Amino acid sequence: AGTELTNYQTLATNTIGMMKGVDGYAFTSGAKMTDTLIQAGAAKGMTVSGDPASGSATLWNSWGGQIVVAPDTAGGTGFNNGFTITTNKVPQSACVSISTGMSRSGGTSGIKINGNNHTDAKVTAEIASSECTADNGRTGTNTLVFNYNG
Amino acid sequence: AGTELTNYQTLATNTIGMMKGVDGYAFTSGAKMTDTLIQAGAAKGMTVSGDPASGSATLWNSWGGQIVVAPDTAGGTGFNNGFTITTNKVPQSACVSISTGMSRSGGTSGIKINGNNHTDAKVTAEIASSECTADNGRTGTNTLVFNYNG
């Protein structure tokens, strides 16, 4: 899951860069925020589909699960808040390597594995192994969420 | 002075510094060298992503082309050590401004515009205007290579 880890880390970095330029407005849906990012070329290493020519581009992970970058309650009478990067249907093995990798990378403000929100951004191999669920045949059953300031 | 030109100049100085700091080993692929540079924070502000082949982070210029920082190994006849910075899909306008700008203040040991290698590190706008090819629609057709210490 080396490519996958690098993809989420860079997507986060690109998103932070893009958000530093937004002022006076905020994204109200992941669909729009994700399409804008794709338009800027912030997701080159991932699978892009949907309809980018119409501003409706969608992002996918290596296993065909959807990836969505969405605002995290944008609005605080000041500066832009945070956002989340959610990746779906992640297989068990990948879920463990990706969640622990993002923890070690240290750039998030929180990592979630299914219904487990590690707001301290610390996820160990022992924690991941337990929280990441078994695949259903060849289909991953894990949803990972990476948060980013806040 | 502009963002684009500055990007190349900061990339070069950061790479010179990184190579100087390496002790006991050497890069053998642009994939690895560029990843390390990105991990070193040398490309903050530029678009980055992940390479499905190696899992390494990739770097991307202002027009959608890739930027690859690679070490200069042995080319069966080549011996100009150091490294090169290659950027593709460069629009004609940028090709002329960037190549000339790098000639003026890039501190290179050579500048190549497509199949023209200015080993004296001197490129004038008259030359660049001729060597840089026209765009295909909004797509740039130029490849620039900045050679460092050969």
Binding site: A40, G41, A43 | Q66, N88, K89
Partner: peptide
């Protein structure tokens, strides 16, 4: 990446 980001690459 998406529109921004040619198909070529390097």
């Amino acid at each position: 990446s998406x529109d921004x980001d040619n198909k070529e690459x390097x």
